[PDB]
Amino acid sequence: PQITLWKRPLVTIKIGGQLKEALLDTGADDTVLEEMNLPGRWKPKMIGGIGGFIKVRQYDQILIEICGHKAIGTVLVGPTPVNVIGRNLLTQIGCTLNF
Amino acid sequence: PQITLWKRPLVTIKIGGQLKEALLDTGADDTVLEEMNLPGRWKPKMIGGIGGFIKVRQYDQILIEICGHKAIGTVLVGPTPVNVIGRNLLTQIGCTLNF
Numbered sequence: 510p511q512i513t514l515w516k517r518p519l520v521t522i523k524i525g526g527q528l529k530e531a532l533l534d535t536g537a538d539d540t541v542l543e544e545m546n547l548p549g550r551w552k553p554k555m556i557g558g559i560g561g562f563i564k565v566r567q568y569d570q571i572l573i574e575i576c577g578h579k580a581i582g583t584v585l586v587g588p589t590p591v592n593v594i595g596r597n598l599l600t601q602i603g604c605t606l607n608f
Numbered sequence: 609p610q611i612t613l614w615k616r617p618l619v620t621i622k623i624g625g626q627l628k629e630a631l632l633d634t635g636a637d638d639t640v641l642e643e644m645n646l647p648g649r650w651k652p653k654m655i656g657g658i659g660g661f662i663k664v665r666q667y668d669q670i671l672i673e674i675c676g677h678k679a680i681g682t683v684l685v686g687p688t689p690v691n692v693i694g695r696n697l698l699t700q701i702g703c704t705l706n707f
């Protein structure tokens with residue numbers, strides 16, 4: 510689809526068998542989701558945003574469907590203010606910016 | 609143009625007679641720029657993201673050019689690690705997400 514930006518580009522995602530709402534965030538390198546239970550091993554990592562750094566759990570090679578488009582990649586879980594879909598997954602679904 | 613997301617979507621902007629680099633950021637409600645000494649009045653604001661909040665100065669009706677596309681609107685100035693063009697200006701240049 511073509512998504513205008515008068516509102517937040519929020520979409521439904523499916524991860525670990527659960528539906529969620531997430532923000533398509535071209536300013537995020539990585540995908541960061543709010544605290545949740547996820548199947549798989551993980552590794553503690555640090556990620557930095559506009560306000561500093563937070564501790565997250567890194568899940569690699571996770572299946573995640575974004576607005577009907579399938580992706581498989583890294584998902585960071587931790588105290589992010591909102592679920593964000595970053596460029597690591599936006600590229601997988603073929604997302605570009607256009608003006 | 610069309611911008612792929614393999615790398616950060618950095619573009620040149622012109623603001624306050626200065627050229628800078630900034631991210632086209634669909635996850636940013638507002639536009640937040642590195643510290644710069646803009647003239648005129650301003651109002652304090654706090655904006656939150658990963659890591660917490662930062663204090664910024666809100667300037668209204670600022671003229672910005674983004675890839676030769678002119679816009680005018682609110683710009684927040686503060687100690688942000690990166691310049692981000694938010695949806696308040698992205699809508700003005702006709703920017704969409706497409707997949």
Ligand SMILES: CC[C@H](C)CN(C[C@@H](O)[C@H](Cc1ccccc1)NC(=O)O[C@H]1CO[C@H]2OCC[C@H]21)S(=O)(=O)c1ccc2c(c1)OCO2
Pocket residue numbers: 532534535536537538539540541556557558559560590591593595633635636637638639640655656657658689690692694
């Ligand atoms: C609440 C939704 C987002 C987290 C909001 N952020 C825009 C993001 O695009 C941000 C923009 C950004 C980009 C680089 C450094 C700091 C902030 N990217 C980000 O935090 O990404 C992190 C996750 O991937 C990693 O790659 C980049 C940092 C990591 S933000 O910078 O904090 C932000 C921008 C304008 C705003 C605002 C918050 O409140 C209202 O106006």
